[PDB]
Amino acid sequence: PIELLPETPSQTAGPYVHIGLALEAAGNPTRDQEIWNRLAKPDAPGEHILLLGQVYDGNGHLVRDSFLEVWQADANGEYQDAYNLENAFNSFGRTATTFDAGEWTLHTVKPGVVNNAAGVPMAPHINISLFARGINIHLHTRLYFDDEAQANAKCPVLNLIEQPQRRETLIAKRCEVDGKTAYRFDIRIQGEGETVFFDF
Amino acid sequence: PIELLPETPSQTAGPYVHIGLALEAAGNPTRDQEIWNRLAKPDAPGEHILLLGQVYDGNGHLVRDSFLEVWQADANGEYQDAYNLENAFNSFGRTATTFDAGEWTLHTVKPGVVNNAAGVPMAPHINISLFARGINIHLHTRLYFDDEAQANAKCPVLNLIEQPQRRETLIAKRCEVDGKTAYRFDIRIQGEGETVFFDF
Amino acid sequence: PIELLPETPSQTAGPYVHIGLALEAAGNPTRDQEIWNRLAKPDAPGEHILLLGQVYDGNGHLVRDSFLEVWQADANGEYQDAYNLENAFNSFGRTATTFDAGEWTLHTVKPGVVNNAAGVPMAPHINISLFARGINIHLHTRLYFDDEAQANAKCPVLNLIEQPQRRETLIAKRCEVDGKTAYRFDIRIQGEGETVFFDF
Amino acid sequence: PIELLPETPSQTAGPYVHIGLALEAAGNPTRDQEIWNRLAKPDAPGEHILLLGQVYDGNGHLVRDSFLEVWQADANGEYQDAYNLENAFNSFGRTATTFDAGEWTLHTVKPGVVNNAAGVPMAPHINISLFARGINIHLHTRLYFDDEAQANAKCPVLNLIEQPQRRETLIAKRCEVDGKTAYRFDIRIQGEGETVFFDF
Amino acid sequence: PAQDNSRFVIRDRNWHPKALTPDYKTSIARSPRQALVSIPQSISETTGPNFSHLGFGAHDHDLLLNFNNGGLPIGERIIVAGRVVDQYGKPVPNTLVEMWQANAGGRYRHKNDRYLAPLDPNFGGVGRCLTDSDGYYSFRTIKPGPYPWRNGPNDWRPAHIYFGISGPSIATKLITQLYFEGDPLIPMCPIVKSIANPEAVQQLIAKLDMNNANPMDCLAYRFDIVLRGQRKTHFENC
Amino acid sequence: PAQDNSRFVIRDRNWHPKALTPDYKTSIARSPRQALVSIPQSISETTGPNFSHLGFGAHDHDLLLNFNNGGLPIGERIIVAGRVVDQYGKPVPNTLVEMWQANAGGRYRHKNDRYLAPLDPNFGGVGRCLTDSDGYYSFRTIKPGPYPWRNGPNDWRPAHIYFGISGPSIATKLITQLYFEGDPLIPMCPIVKSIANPEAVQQLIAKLDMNNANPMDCLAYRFDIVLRGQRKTHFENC
Amino acid sequence: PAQDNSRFVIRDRNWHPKALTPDYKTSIARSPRQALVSIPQSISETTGPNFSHLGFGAHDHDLLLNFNNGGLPIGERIIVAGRVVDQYGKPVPNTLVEMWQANAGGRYRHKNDRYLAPLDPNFGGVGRCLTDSDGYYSFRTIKPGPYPWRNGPNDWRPAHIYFGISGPSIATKLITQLYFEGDPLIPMCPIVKSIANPEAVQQLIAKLDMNNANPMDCLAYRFDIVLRGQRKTHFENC
Ligand SMILES: [Cl-]
Ligand SMILES: [Fe+3]
Ligand SMILES: [Fe+3]
Ligand SMILES: [Fe+3]
Ligand SMILES: [Fe+3]
C-alpha cells in the first residue's frame, strides 16, 4: 500500500510544561505577548462566561500539572484563526492546573452553532486538548453545555458515543462563580465517570 | 554501557513454600533450629508487642498460603544481623498464613528510630517481604505504627509516597489482645486500599 | 550526523591549462571577450599599480606553467562582482606564468580596506588562487603590501598566522618599473620561505 | 602468537597540560603539595647544578607549551623512588616551557654513575620525557654532560647511536647562570640538529 | 474566519506511544481505560490558530540571550534547526514552534525541580519561533543535561528538549521530545520506550549537523518534524 | 557592490585529493609542506565574479564549429551536458563553466605537446558556457583520446575533459577532470588516484546518456557538478 | 632505593598514534624525522617514582568541591572510575592518576583559552588520585563540553578528559585522552584519528556505567587503563 512519511511521534509534555507554555502559571517572568486564558475582551459579541474545572487521575486524585488548549467558535459560530492579542475574540486559548491552583479557568463567550461536514448542526462546544506528565499523547475531548439540552440530544458528534451514560461526561454544568455565569467541566482521565476522549 | 552479570531471575515461591521455609506452619516435623516468628524472648529490652494481619488478593479474598519475612531494628534502633536462637532479640523473623490459620502473627518489640543515609530519622518501621503462589517476585513493604503519628508525618520514606491516602495503607492499628499491646497490619495486594509496595 | 551531497573533487589543471583559461598566454587565438590581467582601465579611481611575481617549486626552480586568479576590492574597499569588459574596474582577473614569460603581471589599483565579518578592518589585500600541473587542489593566498606596515600589523587574518616569520611571506615588495609604482609578490610552494596558504 | 591485552593508546597532552600537571606554570593556584622542578634540597649530597633549555620545532621556532618529566640517579648513583616533598633528594621532577618562560629550568645535583643490565657503567645522565601539543606520544631522550667526555665516549647507551654527529645532540653544555654551575640542554624535535629520541 | 477545506491523514496510534506504558509509572493512573471514540473531521478539527500576528521578541528564539542576567549561560553552545513538513513532504510555513528544556546540568527553572544540580543565573530554558515561508525554524541554546527522576530507583532522562508545534489545525498539533545523536541513555529510558517501534524512536533523535555550525562558536543539531498529511476534500456529500 | 550574506560548507580535504600524492610525480615538489592556515569566511572569500554580462561568441560551447578550417573534426561526436548544484541540492544558475581537452588522438593544441598523434586542423579543444536559469550547461565536442605522459614509464591518461566552474564565490571555484564511463584506464591513473576515496573518483565519471543523444548524429554524456553548500549567516557577532 | 628487577613488554607503536599525523596540523612540525633509537631496558628505564608518600588533599579527586567559590559547578554530575592493570591483567596499585579538563561549555581555566563559552566560577577542572590496593581510582566531576579549535576551518574536539598515569616505571608512564560513549564527534576528530587502528580508538571511549551511579545524584562512566605488561627478568647475562 501507499506509505507516506511517518508522523513525528508524540511524547509526554512532562512536569515542567508550564515553563514553556504557561509562563505565568509556572511563576516565571512573561514575555510581552503570551497565549493564555482570556479569549474574549469585554467588548466581544455574545454571552460572556467563565469555564473552570479540575482534572482527576484513575485513583480519584487531582492532576496538579495539566496543560489544556482550547479551540471554539465565536458567538456568531465563526472560528477566529488569526491569533492576535488585540482581537476582541480569539478562538484559541491555553490554561493549566498547578500546585497552587488545581482548578483551571478560561474566560470566553458561549460558542455559536457550527455545522459538521454533512451540514448537520453540532451543539455548541469547545474543543479541548489535555496534556500532562503521564499522558504520552494528548487527549481530545469536547465541552458541551447543560443548558443546550435540545441541541445536545441532536448533535451528530455526541450521537457517535454509543452509551447515553458516557455522553453525560461531556456536559458542563451551569453554575455561578462570584455571581457570574460559569460552567464547570471536570475531566476524569480513567475509571469511574471516565470522560469520553476522541480520535480524529 | 557497562553490563554486569545478570541477577538470577525470581520465580514464585509456589503453594508449598511452607514445606521448605515454614515447617511447623506446613504441619511437618521441624529440625532442631528453625527461623520463626518470635523475634524477642521475654527478657529483651523494649516494648513487647504482638503483630498480626491478614493478606487479601484483588478480589478481596483471603490469601491462605502467604510467607512473610521481616527485618527490624531492636528497641535501641540498631539492626542485629548475628542470627542466633539463643539471642534475647533477633532482627529477622518469618511468619505465614495457612489454611488452618489465615492470620499471621509475630512476637517482637517495637523498633527504635533509625536514620536514613542522609541522616534524617525514619519513623519506627518493620521491613516486610511478601511471597506466595501468584507472586512472581516478592513484594516489599513497611509496617509503621498508628501511635507514632508525629514521627510518621516526618518520615522521609513515607514522604516519598505522593498521595496521603496511600501512606495510610502502611500504618498498623493499635489494639489489645488478651491485655497485651498489639497492632494489626493487613495487606491488600491489589485494588481498593492496595498496600504501597517499594522498589529499592 | 547530517551528510550533504559531497562536493565534486578537485583535480590538477594540468600542463595545458592556458589553452582553456589563458588563451593569449597559450599562444592561441583569442575570442572577442577574454578574462585577463587588466583589472583597471586608465581612468579607474585609485592608485594605479603594477603587480608581478615568479612562482617556485620545492627545489627552488621556476614554475613555468602556473595559472593565477585574483579577487580584490576597488580603491574604495568594495568588491565589484558584475564582471564586464566595459567597466573601468573589475575586481576579478587572471594571469599566468609560461615558458616564454616566467613572471606573471597584473595591472590594477591598490585595494581599499575591507572589514572582516566581526567588523574589524583587514589590511589591503588581493586574494589569489594558484593552479598548475602537480597542484591537485588550488592553493589560496593573499598578497599584502609592504607600505601598509601599520594596517598589516593589525590585520585579523595576518594575525591568525602563528609565526611572525611566516607572515612576511605574504608581504609584496614595492619598487618602480619604468617610473610606475609596482610590487613584487613571489610565491614559494614548498620548503624554505614557503608561502602561507589558507583554508576557508 | 601470544597476544596480551593491548596497552591504552597515547594521545597528545594538549595546549593546557599545565592546568593538570604544572599548576604554578599555568598561573593557577597550587595545592599543598606539587611535583615540580626542585629535586634537591640545599643539604642534598653531591654537586648542586641548574639545568635549563629551550625546545624547538622543525621550523626552528620555540615550543612555548612543552611539559617535561625527568628521572635521574642521586649523586651516589641511587634512584630515589619514594617520592616525598620532605626528601633531601627526589629522583623525579617536572618542568615546563610557557608563554611567559620559554626556557625550562630544573634544580638538581649531578647524577652518579649507574650500570646497565650487563654491568657496564653508563655515563652520568638524566632521563627525560617530553610532552606537548602536537606530540602524539611522548619523546624519550637523555641529557649527558660535556665535562664527562671520557665516560660519555664509553657509554653503552650512547654507543647505540650509530653516528657520532647524532651523539652530540645529547651532550649538555656547561655554563653559568647568575654565576652558578649550570648545563644547557636544548632539544630540537625535528630537522637540523634533531635530538636523538629513544624507544625502550 | 477559518474554513473547512482540508482533511488530515488519520494518526497511527501504534506509531505514537500508547496511553498505558506501565514502565513509565505515571502513565498507569493517567491513561484512559475506555477506547477513544472516532469522529469524522469537521471544521472544528480541520482548523486551528495561526500565529503570524503574534508579536515575537527579538530574542524569543535565542536562549543564550533571552534570560540575560550579566553573562552567557554555561554549557555546550548549539543551534537546533530543522524543517516542519507534512506527511506528503509539503513544508508547513508560518507555524508556531515552541521549545523548553533544563540547563547544562539537567536543572529546570521551575519551583518543583529540587535536583541538586544548580540553576544557571543566565539560562531560562524557553524558546519560540515561527517557521519561515519554506518551513524552517532555528533556536540557539545550550545542550541540556540528563537528570534523574523518581520512576525506577536509578532512572535518568537522556538529554532532551521539549517541542510543541501547532501546524495548520488542532488535528496536527503535537508535543514531543527531541533527543541527541548517540546518547547512551536513550535505549534505557521508559519514556522513550513508551514508543513501541524502534524506527519511530529514531525520528526523535536530532543529528549532529556540522554543515550548519558556526566555526569557533557553536555546534548545530538538525531536527525535522513531520505533521499529519493534509489533502483537499474529495467526493464528499455526493 | 557584492555583499557578505552567505557562508559555504567547509571543504572535506580528505574527499578532494591531498597535495602530496607521490605516485603523481609532479606533486612531490609542488605540495606545501606546512599546514594550510584556516581563516574565517569574510566578504573577501564569500563573494566572487558573476559573468552574466561576459559576451560569449555563438560557437563558444560548440567545439565542432569553433575551430572551423574547412571541415568537421574527426572523432566521436558527443554532447557533454549536466547540472551545476550546491551540496544542498540548490541549482547554480548563470555560472561560468569552462572546459578544454585534447583531440580524438590525445593531442593538445599547445606548442608544448609533441605527442606524435597528429593535430586535427578542424579542432581546437576549448569551450565555455554560462549555466542557464535552472543550472544546466551543455557542450558539443568530440570524445578526447587518452595519451601517454612522462610519469611512470608506461603511464597513460584516460580520456578526459578539464572543467572549471566559478560558482557564487571564490570559495566555490573549482577545477576538475571529467572521465568517461567504463574507461579501463581510470583505475590505473595516478592522477585519478590522487583521490583516496573510491566513491569520490566515481563522482568524476560521466555516464553515457542515451536519452540526451541526437539519433543518427551524436551520443551524449552526463556530468553533474556539485559545489560547496551555500547557507545564510546565522547568530554571528551576537 | 629502586632496583632493576623487571622488564616491560615493548610498545606497539602502530597501536599508539604515530608522530606524524598531518591532519592534526601541529604534529607536522613537532614530529621527529629520524627513527627512534632502540635501547635495552636498564635500571634507568625499569624504575620510576612511587607516589604513596605524596600528600593528597581531601578534595583532590573531587572536582565538584576542589574549586569551591560559593556554589556547585554547572553541568552533568558524573563519577569517572576504573581500574589500572597491566597487559598481563595484573592490577597496578598505589599509582598516580592525574586528570584535567574543560568545563561544561568546553572552556579551560587557562589564560590562553579565549573561547567565548564562559568560565564557571565553581569549576577548576583538575584532579588526582592514587589507585587503591586493587588498582581502582575514581573522580567526581562534571562532563566537559566539546569545543572548537584552530585546526581545519570547522574542527571540534569531542568532549574529553586528559589522563596521566605513572605506573611502576618511567617506561610505563602514559598520557592519553578519555572520550565518552556515543559522542558523534569522535569519528570526525583528527586527534582521535592520529590512532590508525579503530580498535585502539575504542579503548579510549569511557562507557556509561549505571551500576556505579548515585541515584538521584550523579551518573558514572567507566574507564579502565592498561599499562605495559611487567615481568621478571629471566636468563639474562648467561
Ligand atoms: Cl528541479
Ligand atoms: Fe518528561
Ligand atoms: Fe510454583
Ligand atoms: Fe592533467
Ligand atoms: Fe588536545
Short mmCIF file of all heavy atoms in Angstrom, two decimals, chain G residues 7-30:
data_model
loop_
_atom_site.label_atom_id
_atom_site.label_comp_id
_atom_site.label_asym_id
_atom_site.label_seq_id
_atom_site.Cartn_x
_atom_site.Cartn_y
_atom_site.Cartn_z
N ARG G 7 61.03 -6.33 33.62
CA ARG G 7 61.11 -5.89 32.25
C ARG G 7 59.69 -5.60 31.79
O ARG G 7 58.73 -6.18 32.31
CB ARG G 7 61.70 -7.00 31.36
CG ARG G 7 63.17 -7.37 31.69
CD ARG G 7 64.13 -6.30 31.21
NE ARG G 7 65.50 -6.54 31.68
CZ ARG G 7 66.06 -5.90 32.71
NH1 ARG G 7 65.37 -4.99 33.39
NH2 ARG G 7 67.34 -6.15 33.04
N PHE G 8 59.58 -4.72 30.80
CA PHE G 8 58.28 -4.26 30.32
C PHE G 8 58.10 -4.60 28.86
O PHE G 8 59.00 -4.38 28.03
CB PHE G 8 58.09 -2.76 30.59
CG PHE G 8 58.08 -2.45 32.06
CD1 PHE G 8 59.28 -2.19 32.74
CD2 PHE G 8 56.89 -2.48 32.77
CE1 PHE G 8 59.28 -1.94 34.12
CE2 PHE G 8 56.87 -2.24 34.16
CZ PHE G 8 58.08 -1.98 34.84
N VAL G 9 56.93 -5.15 28.54
CA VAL G 9 56.62 -5.54 27.14
C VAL G 9 56.86 -4.34 26.23
O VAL G 9 56.43 -3.22 26.53
CB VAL G 9 55.16 -6.07 27.02
CG1 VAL G 9 54.80 -6.39 25.55
CG2 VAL G 9 54.97 -7.32 27.92
N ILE G 10 57.57 -4.57 25.12
CA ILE G 10 57.84 -3.48 24.18
C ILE G 10 56.53 -2.88 23.63
O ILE G 10 55.54 -3.60 23.35
CB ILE G 10 58.79 -3.97 23.05
CG1 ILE G 10 60.10 -4.45 23.67
CG2 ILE G 10 59.00 -2.87 21.99
CD1 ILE G 10 60.76 -3.48 24.66
N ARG G 11 56.51 -1.56 23.48
CA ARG G 11 55.33 -0.88 22.98
C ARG G 11 55.07 -1.21 21.53
O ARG G 11 55.99 -1.42 20.75
CB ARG G 11 55.48 0.63 23.11
CG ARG G 11 55.33 1.09 24.56
CD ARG G 11 55.14 2.60 24.61
NE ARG G 11 54.43 2.99 25.81
CZ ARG G 11 54.90 3.75 26.80
NH1 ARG G 11 56.15 4.24 26.78
NH2 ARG G 11 54.08 4.02 27.82
N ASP G 12 53.78 -1.26 21.19
CA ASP G 12 53.39 -1.35 19.78
C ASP G 12 53.12 0.04 19.26
O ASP G 12 52.06 0.61 19.52
CB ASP G 12 52.13 -2.23 19.65
CG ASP G 12 51.69 -2.40 18.19
OD1 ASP G 12 52.25 -1.78 17.27
OD2 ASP G 12 50.73 -3.19 17.97
N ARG G 13 54.08 0.61 18.51
CA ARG G 13 53.98 1.99 18.06
C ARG G 13 53.17 2.13 16.77
O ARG G 13 53.07 3.22 16.22
CB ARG G 13 55.38 2.60 17.96
CG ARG G 13 55.91 2.89 19.36
CD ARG G 13 57.36 3.37 19.34
NE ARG G 13 57.82 3.64 20.71
CZ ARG G 13 57.68 4.80 21.34
NH1 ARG G 13 57.07 5.83 20.74
NH2 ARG G 13 58.17 4.94 22.58
N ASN G 14 52.56 1.01 16.34
CA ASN G 14 51.46 1.07 15.36
C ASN G 14 50.07 0.99 15.98
O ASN G 14 49.05 1.19 15.29
CB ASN G 14 51.65 0.02 14.28
CG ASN G 14 52.66 0.46 13.22
OD1 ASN G 14 52.58 1.59 12.67
ND2 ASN G 14 53.61 -0.41 12.93
N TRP G 15 50.04 0.74 17.29
CA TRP G 15 48.79 0.73 18.06
C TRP G 15 48.61 2.14 18.63
O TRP G 15 47.57 2.76 18.45
CB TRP G 15 48.89 -0.31 19.19
CG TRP G 15 47.65 -0.44 20.03
CD1 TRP G 15 47.45 0.06 21.29
CD2 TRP G 15 46.43 -1.11 19.67
NE1 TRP G 15 46.18 -0.27 21.74
CE2 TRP G 15 45.54 -0.99 20.77
CE3 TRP G 15 46.01 -1.81 18.54
CZ2 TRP G 15 44.26 -1.54 20.77
CZ3 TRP G 15 44.72 -2.37 18.55
CH2 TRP G 15 43.87 -2.23 19.66
N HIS G 16 49.64 2.63 19.34
CA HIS G 16 49.73 4.08 19.60
C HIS G 16 49.66 4.89 18.30
O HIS G 16 49.97 4.37 17.20
CB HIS G 16 51.07 4.39 20.26
CG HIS G 16 51.17 3.80 21.62
ND1 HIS G 16 50.47 4.32 22.69
CD2 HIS G 16 51.83 2.71 22.07
CE1 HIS G 16 50.73 3.59 23.76
NE2 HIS G 16 51.56 2.61 23.42
N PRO G 17 49.29 6.18 18.41
CA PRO G 17 49.37 7.08 17.25
C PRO G 17 50.84 7.25 16.83
O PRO G 17 51.72 7.26 17.70
CB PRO G 17 48.86 8.42 17.80
CG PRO G 17 49.25 8.36 19.30
CD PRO G 17 48.90 6.91 19.64
N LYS G 18 51.10 7.38 15.52
CA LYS G 18 52.44 7.73 15.07
C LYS G 18 52.70 9.20 15.34
O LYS G 18 51.76 9.95 15.65
CB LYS G 18 52.61 7.46 13.57
CG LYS G 18 52.64 5.98 13.27
CD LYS G 18 53.25 5.66 11.91
CE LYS G 18 52.22 5.69 10.81
NZ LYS G 18 52.56 4.67 9.75
N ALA G 19 53.97 9.60 15.21
CA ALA G 19 54.33 11.01 15.43
C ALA G 19 53.73 11.95 14.38
O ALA G 19 53.14 12.98 14.73
CB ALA G 19 55.85 11.15 15.51
N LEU G 20 53.87 11.58 13.10
CA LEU G 20 53.47 12.45 12.01
C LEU G 20 52.08 12.05 11.52
O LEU G 20 51.91 11.01 10.88
CB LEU G 20 54.50 12.40 10.88
CG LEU G 20 54.15 13.26 9.66
CD1 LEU G 20 53.94 14.75 9.99
CD2 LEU G 20 55.22 13.08 8.60
N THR G 21 51.11 12.89 11.86
CA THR G 21 49.69 12.67 11.51
C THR G 21 49.18 14.02 10.98
O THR G 21 48.60 14.80 11.73
CB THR G 21 48.89 12.15 12.76
OG1 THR G 21 49.02 13.04 13.87
CG2 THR G 21 49.36 10.73 13.18
N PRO G 22 49.45 14.32 9.70
CA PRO G 22 49.35 15.72 9.24
C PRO G 22 47.97 16.36 9.31
O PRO G 22 47.89 17.58 9.36
CB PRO G 22 49.82 15.67 7.79
CG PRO G 22 50.59 14.39 7.70
CD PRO G 22 50.04 13.44 8.68
N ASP G 23 46.91 15.55 9.33
CA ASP G 23 45.55 16.10 9.53
C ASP G 23 45.44 16.82 10.86
O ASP G 23 44.65 17.74 11.01
CB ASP G 23 44.47 15.01 9.42
CG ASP G 23 44.23 14.54 7.98
OD1 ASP G 23 44.81 15.11 7.04
OD2 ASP G 23 43.46 13.57 7.79
N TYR G 24 46.27 16.40 11.83
CA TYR G 24 46.41 17.10 13.10
C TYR G 24 47.62 18.05 12.88
O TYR G 24 48.77 17.64 12.96
CB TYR G 24 46.67 16.09 14.23
CG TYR G 24 47.05 16.70 15.57
CD1 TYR G 24 46.67 18.02 15.91
CD2 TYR G 24 47.72 15.94 16.52
CE1 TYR G 24 47.01 18.57 17.13
CE2 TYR G 24 48.07 16.49 17.78
CZ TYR G 24 47.68 17.81 18.07
OH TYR G 24 48.00 18.37 19.31
N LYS G 25 47.32 19.31 12.55
CA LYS G 25 48.32 20.19 11.93
C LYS G 25 49.57 20.44 12.75
O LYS G 25 50.68 20.49 12.20
CB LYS G 25 47.67 21.52 11.52
CG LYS G 25 46.66 21.33 10.37
CD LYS G 25 45.95 22.68 10.09
CE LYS G 25 44.98 22.52 8.92
NZ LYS G 25 44.35 23.86 8.62
N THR G 26 49.42 20.56 14.06
CA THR G 26 50.58 20.86 14.91
C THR G 26 51.59 19.72 14.91
O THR G 26 52.76 19.94 15.19
CB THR G 26 50.14 21.20 16.34
OG1 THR G 26 49.14 22.22 16.26
CG2 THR G 26 51.28 21.73 17.17
N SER G 27 51.14 18.50 14.58
CA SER G 27 52.06 17.37 14.58
C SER G 27 53.10 17.45 13.45
O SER G 27 54.13 16.79 13.51
CB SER G 27 51.32 16.02 14.48
OG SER G 27 50.95 15.75 13.13
N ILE G 28 52.82 18.25 12.42
CA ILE G 28 53.69 18.30 11.25
C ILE G 28 55.08 18.80 11.63
O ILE G 28 56.08 18.21 11.22
CB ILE G 28 53.11 19.19 10.10
CG1 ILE G 28 51.82 18.53 9.57
CG2 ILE G 28 54.13 19.36 8.96
CD1 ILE G 28 50.96 19.44 8.66
N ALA G 29 55.15 19.85 12.44
CA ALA G 29 56.45 20.44 12.80
C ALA G 29 56.99 19.90 14.13
O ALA G 29 58.09 20.25 14.54
CB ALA G 29 56.34 21.97 12.85
N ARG G 30 56.22 19.03 14.80
CA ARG G 30 56.61 18.57 16.14
C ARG G 30 56.81 17.05 16.17
O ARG G 30 56.66 16.43 17.21
CB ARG G 30 55.60 19.01 17.19
CG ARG G 30 55.55 20.53 17.31
CD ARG G 30 54.70 20.97 18.48
NE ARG G 30 54.75 22.45 18.61
CZ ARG G 30 54.33 23.13 19.68
NH1 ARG G 30 53.75 22.50 20.72
NH2 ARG G 30 54.47 24.47 19.71
#
